[PDB]
């Protein structure tokens with residue numbers, strides 16, 4: 453095999469590739485790939501070993517050797533002016549109309565997503581980069597078939613780019629015969645095309661980093677960012693990242709993550725679905741760590757409330773933001789029909805604000821004014837809650853963070869998990885990873901927790917609350933039955949013309965396997981061109 457330091461591209465270039473994959477952009481991407489891919493692969497190997505140690509009976513806990521970091525005073529390098537107020541952020545796909553609508557919403561920040569809300573088709577990833585460049589430059593516009601034009605209002609929301617996680621390949625670009633990291637592809641191109649214009653207008657190149665498991669992964673990101681800064685003669689800490697704590701391993705390393713990325717990091721985030729998905733994956737071999745219906749595993753449960761409070765305390769100790777989670781409801785256009793949903797949003801966001809979160813997430817612009825009002829009321833004239841130290845909280849321990857919550861494993865819950873996961877997967881394999889299902893805007897994490905919970909019940913031979921043993925056979929029977937329910941709900945035309953056969957097959961494959969696969973997106977990606 454050759455010692456090549458060049459990339460290969462599997463797709464022929466059209467107009468879009470000529471815009472994004474310029475000679476200079478590809479030279480920069482190539483440098484990042486050759487400099488950082490070997491270490492990325494070693495990090496993925498380290499994950500395998502850490503998980504083996506947990507499987508073999510040693511539960512996660514804080515790191516003893518780094519006690520000196522945790523018990524010293526220090527803060528992050530800094531937060532730029534336009535990231536000092538992030539009370540509401542909207543998340544969404546990098547599709548052109550969606551980008552315009554999100555930037556125009558009454559929010560502080562739009563997180564444009566190449567990760568869980570994107571089915572990463574090559575054309576969609578390239579189009580996404582084209583759209584974000586046009587958005588940064590202020591020119592992005594879209595005219596629909598009815599002749600309505602969509603353009604940016606004055607003073608759009610601040611833009612932040614979420615990259616693919618460390619496990620994901622970008623299969624259309626290879627180095628030494630192997631797919632390059634999608635993380636590097638997404639980072640390199642958004643950074644390269646936009647850093648100059650972002651900085652000139654008083655903003656900067658900002659990223660969201662998903663699914664981190666360790667401080668060493670954060671250190672890798674800081675090396676990538678420092679390389680990019682140095683390459684274009686930017687001061688250290690020009691690139692700013694917000695990092696989701698949405699894996700169980702990461703909740704024990706938040707302070708070390710903040711330290712390893714201290715030049716670049718400006719906040720951490722709580723979430724629900726990726727985190728409990730990870731809880732199950734991480735504790736997959738523990739018979740006493742079986743979670744009940746994921747629908748019942750709510751943020752107020754002791755282990756999740758401990759996670760929230762620890763994240764807030766840790767972030768604020770270091771002068772970093774502590775972001776709350778997602779309200780994914782799709783409200784009616786008629787306000788008279790939204791009372792129940794908006795009351796739920798108000799209750800949930802009030803809980804977060806009262807706990808000390810600096811901001812929170814929505815998926816739909818119709819929730820912006822409600823979410824903003826909750827934070828406006830509790831913040832008063834404050835921009836954020838960085839001064840909320842939670843010093844009165846007792847220590848939070850691993851036992852508390854690991855304690856499975858009360859609840860039932862129900863047939864209704866299991867069937868609902870099947871319907872939601874299958875409908876998500878059907879949309880994803882058709883190219884849409886941000887999917888309205890039963891009034892919620894769902895991303896991949898919803899399908900992940902749904903299939904992983906069922907896997908856990910099968911693996912540990914658990915009964916449902918009605919006494920039925922959960923088995924592969926029971927799941928297969930229920931799958932067939934719920935496919936008929938989906939068909940009735942959507943109608944013959946939508947169902948027959950859809951990709952539900954293929955979605956059910958993938959769901960069956962990922963749920964009934966003896967081994968718990970890490971991510972459904974890996975086998976799913978094989979179905980994309």
Ligand SMILES: [Mg+2]
Pocket residue numbers: 487
């Ligand atoms: Mg070099």
Ligand SMILES: [Mg+2]
Pocket residue numbers: 674675678715
């Ligand atoms: Mg450094």
Ligand SMILES: [Mg+2]
Pocket residue numbers: 568662696698723726897
């Ligand atoms: Mg997530």
